[PDB]
Amino acid sequence: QLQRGLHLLTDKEYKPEYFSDALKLDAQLDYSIGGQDLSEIFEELVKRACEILDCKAILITFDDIDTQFDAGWDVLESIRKFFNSRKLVVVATGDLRLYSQLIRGKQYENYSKTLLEQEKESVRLAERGYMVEHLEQQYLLKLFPVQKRIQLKTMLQL
Amino acid sequence: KIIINLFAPNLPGSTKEDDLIQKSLRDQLVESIRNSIAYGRNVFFVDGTRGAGKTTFINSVVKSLNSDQDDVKVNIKCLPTIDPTKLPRHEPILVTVTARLNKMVSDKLKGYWASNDYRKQKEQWQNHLAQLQRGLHLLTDKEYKPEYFSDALKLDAQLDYSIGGQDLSEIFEELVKRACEILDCKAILITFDDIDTQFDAGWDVLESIRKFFNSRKLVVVATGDLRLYSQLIRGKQYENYSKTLLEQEKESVRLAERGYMVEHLEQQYLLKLFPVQKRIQLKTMLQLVGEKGKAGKEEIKVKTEPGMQDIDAIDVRQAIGDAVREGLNLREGSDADMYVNELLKQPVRLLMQVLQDFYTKKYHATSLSVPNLLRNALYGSMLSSIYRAGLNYEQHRFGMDSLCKDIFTYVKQDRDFNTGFYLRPQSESEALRNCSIYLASQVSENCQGSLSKFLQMLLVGCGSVSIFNQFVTELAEKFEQLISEYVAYMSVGRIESASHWANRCCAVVANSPNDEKIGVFLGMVQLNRKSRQHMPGGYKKFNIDTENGLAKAAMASSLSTVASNNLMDFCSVFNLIGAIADISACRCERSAITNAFNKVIAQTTCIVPPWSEATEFSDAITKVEQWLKNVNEIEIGIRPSALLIGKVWSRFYFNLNNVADQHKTRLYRNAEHGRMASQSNAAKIMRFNVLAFLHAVLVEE
Amino acid sequence: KIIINLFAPNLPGSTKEDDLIQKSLRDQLVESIRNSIAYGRNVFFVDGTRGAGKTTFINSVVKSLNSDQDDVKVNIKCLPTIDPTKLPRHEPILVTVTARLNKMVSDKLKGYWASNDYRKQKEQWQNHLAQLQRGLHLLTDKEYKPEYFSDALKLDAQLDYSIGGQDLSEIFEELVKRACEILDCKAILITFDDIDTQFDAGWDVLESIRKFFNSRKLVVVATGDLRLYSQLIRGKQYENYSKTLLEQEKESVRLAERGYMVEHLEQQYLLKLFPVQKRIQLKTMLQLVGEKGKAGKEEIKVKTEPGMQDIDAIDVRQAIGDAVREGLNLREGSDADMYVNELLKQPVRLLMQVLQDFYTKKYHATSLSVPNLLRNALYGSMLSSIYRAGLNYEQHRFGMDSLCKDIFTYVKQDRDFNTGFYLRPQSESEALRNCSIYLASQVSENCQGSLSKFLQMLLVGCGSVSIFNQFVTELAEKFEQLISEYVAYMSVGRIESASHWANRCCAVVANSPNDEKIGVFLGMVQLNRKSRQHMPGGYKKFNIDTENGLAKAAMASSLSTVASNNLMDFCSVFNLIGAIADISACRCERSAITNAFNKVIAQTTCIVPPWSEATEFSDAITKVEQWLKNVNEIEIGIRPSALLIGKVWSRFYFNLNNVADQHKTRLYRNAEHGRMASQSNAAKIMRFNVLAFLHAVLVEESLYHSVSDREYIGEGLRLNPVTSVDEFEKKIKIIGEKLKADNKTWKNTHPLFFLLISCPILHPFIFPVGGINCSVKALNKETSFNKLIDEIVGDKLLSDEEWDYLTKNQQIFQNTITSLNSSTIVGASYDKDTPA
Numbered sequence A: 001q002l003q004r005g006l007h008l009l010t011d012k013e014y015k016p017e018y019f020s021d022a023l024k025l026d027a028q029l030d031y032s033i034g035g036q037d038l039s040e041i042f043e044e045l046v047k048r049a050c051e052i053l054d055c056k057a058i059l060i061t062f063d064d065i066d067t068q069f070d071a072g073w074d075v076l077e078s079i080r081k082f083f084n085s086r087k088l089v090v091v092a093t094g095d096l097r098l099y100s101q102l103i104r105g106k107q108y109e110n111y112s113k114t115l116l117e118q119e120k121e122s123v124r125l126a127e128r129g130y131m132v133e134h135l136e137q138q139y140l141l142k143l144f145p146v147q148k149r150i151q152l153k154t155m156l157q158l
Numbered sequence B: 001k002i003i004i005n006l007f008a009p010n011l012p013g014s015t016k017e018d019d020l021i022q023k024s025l026r027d028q029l030v031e032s033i034r035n036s037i038a039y040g041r042n043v044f045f046v047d048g049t050r051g052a053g054k055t056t057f058i059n060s061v062v063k064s065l066n067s068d069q070d071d072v073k074v075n076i077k078c079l080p081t082i083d084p085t086k087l088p089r090h091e092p093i094l095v096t097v098t099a100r101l102n103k104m105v106s107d108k109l110k111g112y113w114a115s116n117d118y119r120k121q122k123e124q125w126q127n128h129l130a131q132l133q134r135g136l137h138l139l140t141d142k143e144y145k146p147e148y149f150s151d152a153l154k155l156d157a158q159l160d161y162s163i164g165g166q167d168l169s170e171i172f173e174e175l176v177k178r179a180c181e182i183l184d185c186k187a188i189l190i191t192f193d194d195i196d197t198q199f200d201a202g203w204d205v206l207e208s209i210r211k212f213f214n215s216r217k218l219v220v221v222a223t224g225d226l227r228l229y230s231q232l233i234r235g236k237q238y239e240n241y242s243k244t245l246l247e248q249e250k251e252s253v254r255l256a257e258r259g260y261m262v263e264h265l266e267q268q269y270l271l272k273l274f275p276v277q278k279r280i281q282l283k284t285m286l287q288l289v290g291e292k293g294k295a296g297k298e299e300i301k302v303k304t305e306p307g308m309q310d311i312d313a314i315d316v317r318q319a320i321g322d323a324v325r326e327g328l329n330l331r332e333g334s335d336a337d338m339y340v341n342e343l344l345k346q347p348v349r350l351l352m353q354v355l356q357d358f359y360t361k362k363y364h365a366t367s368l369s370v371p372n373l374l375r376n377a378l379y380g381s382m383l384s385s386i387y388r389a390g391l392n393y394e395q396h397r398f399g400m401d402s403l404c405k406d407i408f409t410y411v412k413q414d415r416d417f418n419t420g421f422y423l424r425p426q427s428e429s430e431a432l433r434n435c436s437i438y439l440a441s442q443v444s445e446n447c448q449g450s451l452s453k454f455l456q457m458l459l460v461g462c463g464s465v466s467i468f469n470q471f472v473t474e475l476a477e478k479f480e481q482l483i484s485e486y487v488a489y490m491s492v493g494r495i496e497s498a499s500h501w502a503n504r505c506c507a508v509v510a511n512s513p514n515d516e517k518i519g520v521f522l523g524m525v526q527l528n529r530k531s532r533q534h535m536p537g538g539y540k541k542f543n544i545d546t547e548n549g550l551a552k553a554a555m556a557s558s559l560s561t562v563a564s565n566n567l568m569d570f571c572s573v574f575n576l577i578g579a580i581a582d583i584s585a586c587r588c589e590r591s592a593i594t595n596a597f598n599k600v601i602a603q604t605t606c607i608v609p610p611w612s613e614a615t616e617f618s619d620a621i622t623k624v625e626q627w628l629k630n631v632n633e634i635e636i637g638i639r640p641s642a643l644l645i646g647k648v649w650s651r652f653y654f655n656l657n658n659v660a661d662q663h664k665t666r667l668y669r670n671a672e673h674g675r676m677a678s679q680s681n682a683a684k685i686m687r688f689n690v691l692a693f694l695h696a697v698l699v700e701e
Numbered sequence C: 001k002i003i004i005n006l007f008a009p010n011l012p013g014s015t016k017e018d019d020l021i022q023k024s025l026r027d028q029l030v031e032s033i034r035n036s037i038a039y040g041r042n043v044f045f046v047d048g049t050r051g052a053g054k055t056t057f058i059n060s061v062v063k064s065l066n067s068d069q070d071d072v073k074v075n076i077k078c079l080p081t082i083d084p085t086k087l088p089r090h091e092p093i094l095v096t097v098t099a100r101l102n103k104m105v106s107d108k109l110k111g112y113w114a115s116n117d118y119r120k121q122k123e124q125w126q127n128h129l130a131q132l133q134r135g136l137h138l139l140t141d142k143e144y145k146p147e148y149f150s151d152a153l154k155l156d157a158q159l160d161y162s163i164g165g166q167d168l169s170e171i172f173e174e175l176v177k178r179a180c181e182i183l184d185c186k187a188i189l190i191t192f193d194d195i196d197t198q199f200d201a202g203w204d205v206l207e208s209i210r211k212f213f214n215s216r217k218l219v220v221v222a223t224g225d226l227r228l229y230s231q232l233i234r235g236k237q238y239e240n241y242s243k244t245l246l247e248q249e250k251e252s253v254r255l256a257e258r259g260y261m262v263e264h265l266e267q268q269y270l271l272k273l274f275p276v277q278k279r280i281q282l283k284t285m286l287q288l289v290g291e292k293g294k295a296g297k298e299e300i301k302v303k304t305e306p307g308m309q310d311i312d313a314i315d316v317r318q319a320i321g322d323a324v325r326e327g328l329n330l331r332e333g334s335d336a337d338m339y340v341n342e343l344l345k346q347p348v349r350l351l352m353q354v355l356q357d358f359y360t361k362k363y364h365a366t367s368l369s370v371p372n373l374l375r376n377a378l379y380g381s382m383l384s385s386i387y388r389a390g391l392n393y394e395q396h397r398f399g400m401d402s403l404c405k406d407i408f409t410y411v412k413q414d415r416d417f418n419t420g421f422y423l424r425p426q427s428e429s430e431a432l433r434n435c436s437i438y439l440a441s442q443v444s445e446n447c448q449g450s451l452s453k454f455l456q457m458l459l460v461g462c463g464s465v466s467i468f469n470q471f472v473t474e475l476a477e478k479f480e481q482l483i484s485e486y487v488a489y490m491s492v493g494r495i496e497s498a499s500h501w502a503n504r505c506c507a508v509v510a511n512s513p514n515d516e517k518i519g520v521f522l523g524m525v526q527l528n529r530k531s532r533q534h535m536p537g538g539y540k541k542f543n544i545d546t547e548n549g550l551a552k553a554a555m556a557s558s559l560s561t562v563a564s565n566n567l568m569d570f571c572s573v574f575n576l577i578g579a580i581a582d583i584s585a586c587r588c589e590r591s592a593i594t595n596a597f598n599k600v601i602a603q604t605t606c607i608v609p610p611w612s613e614a615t616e617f618s619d620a621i622t623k624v625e626q627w628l629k630n631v632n633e634i635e636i637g638i639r640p641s642a643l644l645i646g647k648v649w650s651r652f653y654f655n656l657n658n659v660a661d662q663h664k665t666r667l668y669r670n671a672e673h674g675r676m677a678s679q680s681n682a683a684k685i686m687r688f689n690v691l692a693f694l695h696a697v698l699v700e701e702s703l704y705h706s707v708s709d710r711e712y713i714g715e716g717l718r719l720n721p722v723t724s725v726d727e728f729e730k731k732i733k734i735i736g737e738k739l740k741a742d743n744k745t746w747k748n749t750h751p752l753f754f755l756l757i758s759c760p761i762l763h764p765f766i767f768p769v770g771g772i773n774c775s776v777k778a779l780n781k782e783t784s785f786n787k788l789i790d791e792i793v794g795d796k797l798l799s800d801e802e803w804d805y806l807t808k809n810q811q812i813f814q815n816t817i818t819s820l821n822s823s824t825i826v827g828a829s830y831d832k833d834t835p836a
């Protein structure tokens, strides 16, 4: 059933023919939310895997996006969209000021390119920077709670 | 009459019957939602305090609506809350709503008992559902194909549509009507989460509400920021203009009316999508109760101690008022009340949570260090604010060295170097407006139960901003460079002793020139290392050897020599206070007395600031080693606050300006021993310096 | 008879007869449409801005024409209204029109009785639909194909088709002609809804009308905004140009003509599609109600509460006025209806959502704080303007801090620093004119039932605007940087107390470069902090300990110290106003009043701004509490407004300009006595400074305070006296004989003025020792002037001997300042004498 819904992750457009397969409740799993929800399907997939593996939680670990920090947007999006369960623990590594630079670039992509070019005055541009800074500081707060953030110490601090 | 149990076995991470506090408005909001059904596009917008429980409230809104079905005269069925950000990048909202509407209908269909009703409704649903499937290509098509015209002319429909065309607005309108009949409800509630963390996905939400969700059987509750929804709508209006018109008309006369038209387009877009009378404001704690004198809008109580009955419960304002006063060492007045109002503006879940952490740990602690107790309770709920403020977020670094840095950076970020060391929550940004109480609790704890740590903030933590305010003017990123190197010279991050901070403080004040170069500056007088010939009266040079016990070591502690292009000798009250900190911090052992005693008689040169262009003592030893015996029991009594430390220095700093002004302006030749106030000398000024310190301590305490 | 029900849904779908704002237009548009058919393109246009009610109006026209189908001799069949914004993105308008027309024809075919005509006309309709089906690709093709040519030469269509080219215009013309035969109508009304939501979609509507709707059997009515259609049309004529020519001919000699040529193309395109004689403008609510004196075009009424009948309705002009008269605390006059006029000119959607959110929350509260009810309405209604204007948006911060910051930024963009703090909706911009009434609702609510907050607006809100204008602006980008320093220095939006702001304001008046080095600044005097030789008369260094109770405390607040190169003590009048604001905030406890008097004098270290290059004391608190308790019993009924607060400051600020220079030179050697008006020593400068504020609160509040409906100042000249008391005295005298005629008190009429004239701090400043003029006529006016103050206050300020000692040149005073006149002002070298 996860393979049936993987097209949503990679589709470049919506196919109206898939609406007939987004309406079937033939699955005995009885997913609470209607329609094929990749977040929901992965939840019982992880819940099933915990019973098979006989463990309370599964630890998903990600390396640091250093040689290519554009690849970390999928990591950030997959954590919030899918890896949100009591059975899942996520640990990520990387420069926080590099993830912030990555999130900041994405928050600027939600602005229409016409608006950016046609509103260059300081009063509007400054407000855009305040909104983007506020938008991406809350993104990091939701994705990475501060009480769970851990900073690696250097020799001078060791 | 809401009673909040802080010690209830229920975890605060879930929503239950009146577990939150907004339920006074939620009932009217539920009533208002049902009010619009008795008679259209009913779209309610939900907002609140910045970063409040937006997701939490709407989940409780639909929870309280799906429960009561028959006991309520008007029935409303609620879809699961739709998060447009956690949706497929191309899946339409109409598909998402239908996919969740289909399951609610299907589950009700499986709940039918009669086959006669079940069969006729199931085929009516599927015939309605197949009509929507035949038209979903209209949403996604990038080009019109001629074969769709035959579909648009297919009038062989028992559904009896109003208009001829293949309008998805009326196909979905009839689909909702059938869903209402199956679910036996007058309306269906569609709720959307905030469009934050990806706000380009909220356009599909806005367009779906505008075009498809404008039926009288549909209620839409949207959540988010109107400032961000305005930002989205504004951008789409510009894209209506042709790119050639924008490029070929860039003159300000046309560029202004172009922007004066779009701002009119977004103004009427929100007023149409979200009517003002339907916009909902999530009240904060302060609005729910009001002020101390103003009559309470709705009495709300908090169980301070476990097992306490409803009659013995106290108001929320005094629940945090007692907590804040105990932790911040503040009297029952207006200084602590403005902190109470500051905490009353926090999110309603955060206010109950910070109360729980303080009280629950208090019960365990008693079964004390209340300022320490409030810091840990505030840290759990404010840790977001400290991290974004660049302050000390390291849970084990909450000591004395880090406190000096925190006060410095807080003043710099808040941009008030004359009153920012009072640590009042007068800032505008949430992070700085919330870091005051945390820093006030840090000061109220690090200095509580000690004497040397009172001066270690008055002279260092709080005294570093008044010197800077006397420093920035004479000099004015370069300003950003100035503060970074200002910390390094004072060693604000790492003070080994308060006698060294004042040792380098005299070299800073002396750098600034005076009028006529009298040799008098803030709280100090410039002594001369070499004698002046032919001085009327007895104005000789200074030699330390002339003084006696408790008059030589004390003067040596106040003495300070700064090496520059010209060697200079200085005496200051600040150097005298630095000697007090070393002695107070040192132990009661007589062998441990000398290390602080010798250090204040070290007579070591002080480097000029980088930015500048440049046993006889046993009589004193027994007194200082006996006074610190008296210090130990007194230290327990004193409970300093951040307000007290700033206030004492504020009068102390201001008075030294007057002392250095009322004595340098009287030029004299025979006023060694002052018989009248119109006479002054080197020693007479230092009389009023310590009196300025003692009087300031007296009045403010 | 138009009765708008505010508690009704009030939506285009739910709008019926008897509550249509546009009814004369609907009646006359139908007649014009009918006459054009009784006698090419027949296209009508209904114009109007966004929210003017185009969708509501045009639906009624369809309803009006649909009713009485057979009865009207001229027959018109109306298709359902087409909304271009809600249509599918890529479908043609011709498809939408035909699909709706097909259903109308189809339902008529199924209504026939004879089986022959139904069968005959069904195939004729299907034949035309098949022809249209065949040719729709001509619209949606990205290129031509050779095999289409064989389709163009097919002349076996069996219809006339006078021209053979597979012309979609002619195919639709015959399809419409056939549709009229089946429907038995003279014409078919195609209706288009406004495109204001997305005007990009309006190009296909415009193109379809001229290409396909040219039949005499078709009549078209379209709604929208011509200035919105113009930018749509003009944006397409720019696409007809070759791009390469655009960069190459970038010279201003050709770019001007190119912009000229597009104007001619747009002008005729709008004239080609919509003839001027067919256009109709949707009248604004103001244009339908007129003004007070002149009767409006229609007499519209509104319903403010549910459950009433139509006879209980009131006119919209009154209903908006009541929300302005009460919500903004304005009496009837030229400034109240002028707020209503600005709201009437607003779009109907914006006006309804003000008149709804106000009364919906007013009937659900009364079953109060009317200024708060209006403020909530104008916060969301003007919300988009607030974001554009860069104001404060958080409702959980709607307090004194945010309001004083909004005023400075509102005039920072309004380009009106002189009188822009009235928040008058007179700006040329639309956003700033919208925020002019939202910020005015801020003032009328945050100052309702208060005096400390009212003075805070007067001193910090209006004050910081004026002090910036005449003392900081001369140094100014720099202007943005200067405001970044002025606001930060003066702490606008984050003040601790009004006196703390005053301790900084008094520096700013002195920080600006002033010539002649005279210490008589604007609203303050720089008393010398030291002394030297050559001091004539009884002139010496200023002493604070010389004064007695209620004389030390009154001036202790008044003193300010700036930490310049040399510390400079400043005595001002803003400090007195700042202290009163701080004291009026204090409650009935005497343990906190002593903090108010002492937080202002000590610990004051006001560094120069970056842009600057360089027990009798207990006998006063019992009087303060007798006045503080008098504040809390009368201040509840205080109803101030943004106009009144600004107007009071306007009269107040002008006097300080007069006293600054009218007394600057009048300092002579024999000025200590102050017997003659020529002498203007420091005890007379501040006597009139306080008398300036009391007079500003006297006349201005007697003009605009909403509690009073009858003018009490009366007809005359208002000269706000300097160097005189006569005209100040007479106005109090005139009101006294006028209040007595109406048997009306001195408290309900002037709650604002009474509590300031009875302020204990201001009393020792009304009659100082180096004050009162001592000529034969000066004592004549001042004898009654002192009596008048005692009468209105209710208790004597000076006894019989106290007045006699002041007039005739020792007995100490517990209610009069003594040492002020002996003090000398910096830069005032008394090298001359008073002329005789």
Ligand SMILES: Nc1ncnc2c1ncn2[C@@H]1O[C@H](COP(=O)(O)OP(=O)(O)OP(=O)(O)O)[C@@H](O)[C@H]1O
Residues within 6 Å of the ligand: B272, C004, C010, C011, C012, C015, C019, C020, C021, C022, C049, C050, C051, C052, C053, C054, C055, C056, C057, C193, C194, C196, C197, C348, C349, C350, C352
């Ligand atoms: N005749 C009327 N009676 C009562 N209220 C009216 C009337 N005309 C307009 N309104 C109010 O003004 C609003 C204006 O909406 P309307 O749709 O009529 O205008 P529009 O902006 O031209 O249309 P659209 O919604 O298509 O953009 C209505 O929603 C309603 O609140």
